[PDB]
Amino acid sequence: GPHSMRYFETAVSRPGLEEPRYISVGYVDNKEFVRFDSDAENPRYEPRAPWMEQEGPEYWERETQKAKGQEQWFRVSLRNLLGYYNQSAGGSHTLQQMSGCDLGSDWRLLRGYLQFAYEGRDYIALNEDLKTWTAADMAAQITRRKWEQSGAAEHYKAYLEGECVEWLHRYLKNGNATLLRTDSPKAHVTHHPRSKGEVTLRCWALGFYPADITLTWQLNGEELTQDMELVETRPAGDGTFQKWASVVVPLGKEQNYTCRVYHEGLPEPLTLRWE
């Protein structure tokens, strides 16, 4: 039911290098649809889903103008954290940001997000009331206090409930059908020798979208579920995903086992076994 827009931004210190690398990447429903990168020859926000190709040159310039601003924001915060943490210059440091809004089932704002991370650790987050902050540690206090005193939260609150909400609607209108799309898994089972009378039957799911899936091995009243070997879901690199489930098995008694595949795409669940 829900839907969301989110922006992921990173800034990385570069030793001496008067400027740090800055990256921003936007997601609608976990799909990447815009990206801005400091290191580009001519850096600007750049479409990364088909449906962003409509937005005229007015939009890309404004969104680019914004990144220019964020760059400085991060160049400075990055420098302020050095001090909070007693870190010197000539080091590599990372600042990351996650921000955006969630729409509920009945197309109203369900909650807002603004999280920060320093060196890969939670640093500071706006709470759900979008007025008050959670700071991760002592050092985060120095920022919590400063932000409380500036009432910085009011500004994010406005974005989260205003602009964020309205643009998500806008993109969801331009990319509705594209986002709902399914690619159904294509399955098959392989047979590999293992040792004295054991065998490996692995069950492949290939070519599917989105990543979320479920693979199950059964004898009958499907038992074991301790010994099943699993791989994390992996991107084929073409837009599709992959995944596999294996079990170790007595020889001859080969066909009492049955892999089962489950995915939004499927007209019906997949059912298969060796051969």
């Binding site: 815009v34 404004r62 964020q70 400075v76 915060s77 500004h155 994010y156 602009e163």
Partner: peptide, 9 residues
């Protein structure tokens, strides 16, 4: 559209 941060850290 992206957001521009306010107060720095």
């Amino acid at each position: 559209a992206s957001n521009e941060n306010a107060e720095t850290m």
